[PDB]
Design a protein around this ligand. Structure first.
Ligand SMILES: [Ca+2]
Ligand SMILES: [Ca+2]
Ligand SMILES: [Ca+2]
Ligand SMILES: [Fe+2]
Length: 669
């Protein structure tokens, strides 16, 4: 009898309703009857309201769960986004919290505070009510596949076709669209599009980014031409992947001491084997270019060497896999300057497509999408991990939906930007995926398994430093939570839910279809340290990974000559033919280069309603310990944030892509 119901409404556009809301409290001695919550001569549940409704009914025992019920809205978006509900029984000395943060269509059952594992002590009704929702989730979130060689994704024709809980905030859409090719016009590039001519000089390209006032001028926009900075980027550029330490030269990359020598402080075979030689091998390329707009791309491999002064230097570039008089080994000593510059460019077009399609779209978006769908399908609003993932899985589902049309679809801004845009990009994506493995998403392992792990040999690798820093915090945090709710490795095995989660991804997420090699995803969890491992990788990829590989694009591609996406001619068959003209009639044309900035501009736009790593402002989480763990976590993030800046306050080109307050909680683009 007599309950105080504090009903805070989210501030999301539309978060409010004008539907007749009634609540039904249920508990020990029983349940009441839907009580109308509504202040007179007052507009209840608006914009981002927070109201205290006093109502009176049967005396439900200890309140075991509540039920909010709406009704089509009012005459003059009856979808209500409830943030939280906090009721108080005038007969119970507790303060029932009911974190929600979801849209309330017709109904919405909410369990009290503390997050629980499906097996924890739950009154009969609170389960069956939980198992209840799960049957519903596996109904409004079902798999669909585009092909046998792509991770499964959420079924939904259009963005607005998928569940409102996963849809883009009006702001995300507004930001998306405004930023869309609408923002192409504000860049002052519009004309270049209808311009299929060449450029007069490297420096000419510079225009494409003048009216892109934000973020500032691209880093490499004034050092791109320099070998030293050309190498720098393989460590701190947008593709911090690929580069692996070279223990021995690949049999088809006949680099000899008689090739490099010149660029060696301190021998070659001695250098290799002394940890001062790293290599990049784009063998995965072999796709279809073009889209007479004829495009090109290679599958080269380059050799780098760490200077007497820690600079990773480009010493050898074989444009294509099969060595030969036709695919020569280009050195930074090519007596014909242009020929070496042309080599680097080719290495560039390759990286560009490799990076955009593979290490960004597939490896951060598309693949981890599966996990996020598994999250809604298998974990319940109550499960600790659902509450842990929620703030990180947002935006993938939405942006990927949009993306399959707008991004990688035909005539999509990407499609008509890379040299694999004809559709070769779709097939190439499949190749890359047939080889993705969950063990790749583990930064520490990955880094280490590449021989890129050591500071003394490979100095100046901030992606690594900054990455590991964040990973160790993310890992730490995730850990403690698992601890809180998972008392031991048995609770893990016991958790039927987390078992279904990781399994949905195993058998339907990254399907190990024919060609594919095992995708390294478990089929169940055996320990806590393992659950921790997967979870950490997953969130680190949703946040840190994505940011360091995507948001670094304005700088990277900023001045297209620094990272060409398309090449209009075949690669040098002989040597010494490269002309400023030639290598300028090969680089992306005026409109092509315009299509780049355009794509990149849209790809790298933060919305106003963004939340970063720390932020959990709109998460369930009631348990005191968790909250602490969180703040503990946020405290480490701060440190990293400071320490990182000190680092930058001290180097020629500051690595700011992994700064906590720039790393979105998830992947929304
Ligand atoms: Ca509404
Ligand atoms: Ca209202
Ligand atoms: Ca009213
Ligand atoms: Fe993205």
């Amino acid at each position: 009898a007599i309950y105080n119901v504090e009903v805070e409404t989210g501030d999301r556009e539309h978060a409010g309703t004008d539907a007749t809301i009634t609540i039904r409290i249920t508990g020990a001695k029983g349940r009441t009857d839907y009580l109308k919550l509504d202040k007179w001569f007052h507009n209840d549940f608006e914009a981002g309201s927070k109201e205290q409704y006093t109502v009176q009914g049967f005396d439900v025992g200890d309140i075991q769960l509540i039920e909010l019920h709406s009704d089509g809205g009012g005459y003059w978006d009856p979808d209500w986004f409830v943030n939280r509900v906090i009721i108080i029984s005038s007969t119970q000395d507790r303060v029932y919290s009911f974190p929600c943060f979801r849209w309330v269509i017709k109904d919405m059952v909410l369990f009290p505070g503390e997050a629980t594992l499906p097996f924890n002590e739950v009154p009969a009704i609170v389960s069956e009510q939980r198992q209840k929702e799960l049957e519903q989730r596996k109904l409004t979130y079902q798999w669909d596949y585009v092909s046998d060689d792509m991770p499964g994704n959420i079924k939904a024709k259009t963005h607005d076709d998928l569940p409102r809980d996963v849809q883009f905030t009006d702001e995300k859409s507004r930001s998306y669209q405004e930023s869309r090719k609408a923002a192409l016009v504000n860049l002052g590039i519009g004309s270049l599009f209808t311009m299929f001519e060449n450029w007069d000089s490297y420096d000419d390209y510079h225009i494409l980014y003048r009216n892109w006032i934000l973020g500032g001028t691209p880093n490499m926009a004034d050092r791109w031409h320099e070998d030293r900075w050309f190498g720098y980027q393989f460590l701190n550029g947008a593709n911090p992947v690929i580069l692996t330490r070279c223990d021995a030269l690949p049999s088809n990359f006949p680099v000899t001491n008689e090739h490099v020598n010149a660029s060696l402080d301190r021998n070659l075979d001695e250098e290799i084997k002394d940890g001062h030689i790293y290599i990049v091998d784009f063998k995965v390329l072999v796709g279809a270019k073009s889209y007479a707009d004829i495009r090109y791309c290679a599958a080269p491999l380059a050799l780098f060497y760490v200077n007497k002064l820690g600079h990773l230097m480009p010493i050898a570039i074989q444009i294509n896999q099969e060595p030969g008089p036709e695919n020569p080994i280009w050195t930074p000593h090519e007596e014909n300057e242009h020929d070496w510059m042309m080599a680097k460019f080719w290495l560039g077009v390759a990286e560009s497509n490799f990076h955009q399609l593979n290490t960004h779209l597939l490896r951060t978006h598309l693949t981890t999408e599966s996990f996020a769908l598994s999250t809604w399908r298998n974990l319940a609003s109550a499960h600790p991990v659902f509450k842990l993932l929620q703030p990180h899985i947002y935006g993938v589902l939405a942006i990927d939906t949009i993306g399959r049309k707008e991004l990688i679809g035909s005539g999509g801004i990407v499609d008509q930007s890379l040299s694999l845009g004809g559709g070769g990009h779709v097939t190439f994506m499949e190749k890359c995926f047939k080889e993705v493995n969950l063990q790749d998403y583990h930064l520490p392992n990955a880094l280490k398994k590449r021989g890129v792990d050591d500071p003394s040999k490979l100095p100046g690798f901030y992606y690594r430093d900054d990455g590991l820093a964040l990973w160790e915090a993310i890992e730490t945090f995730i850990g403690e939570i698992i601890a809180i709710f998972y008392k031991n490795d048995d609770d893990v095995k016991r958790d039927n839910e987390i078992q279904s989660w990781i399994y949905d991804v195993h058998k339907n997420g990254w399907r190990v279809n024919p060609g594919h090699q095992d995708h390294g995803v478990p089929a169940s969890f055996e320990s806590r340290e393992q659950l921790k491992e997967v979870l950490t990788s997953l969130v680190f990829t949703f946040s840190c990974q994505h940011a360091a590989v995507n948001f670094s694009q304005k700088d990277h591609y900023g001045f297209t000559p620094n990272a060409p996406a398309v090449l209009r001619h075949p690669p040098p068959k002989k040597k010494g033919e490269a002309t400023l003209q030639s290598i300028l009639s090969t680089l992306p044309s005026k409109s092509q280069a315009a299509k780049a900035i355009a794509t990149v501009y849209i790809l790298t736009k933060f919305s106003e309603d963004e939340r970063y790593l720390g932020n959990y402002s709109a998460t369930a989480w009631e348990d005191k310990d968790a909250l602490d763990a969180i703040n503990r976590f946020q405290d480490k993030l701060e440190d990293i944030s400071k320490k990182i800046k000190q680092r930058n306050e001290n180097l020629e080109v500051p690595y700011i892509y992994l700064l906590p307050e720039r790393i979105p909680n998830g992947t929304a683009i």
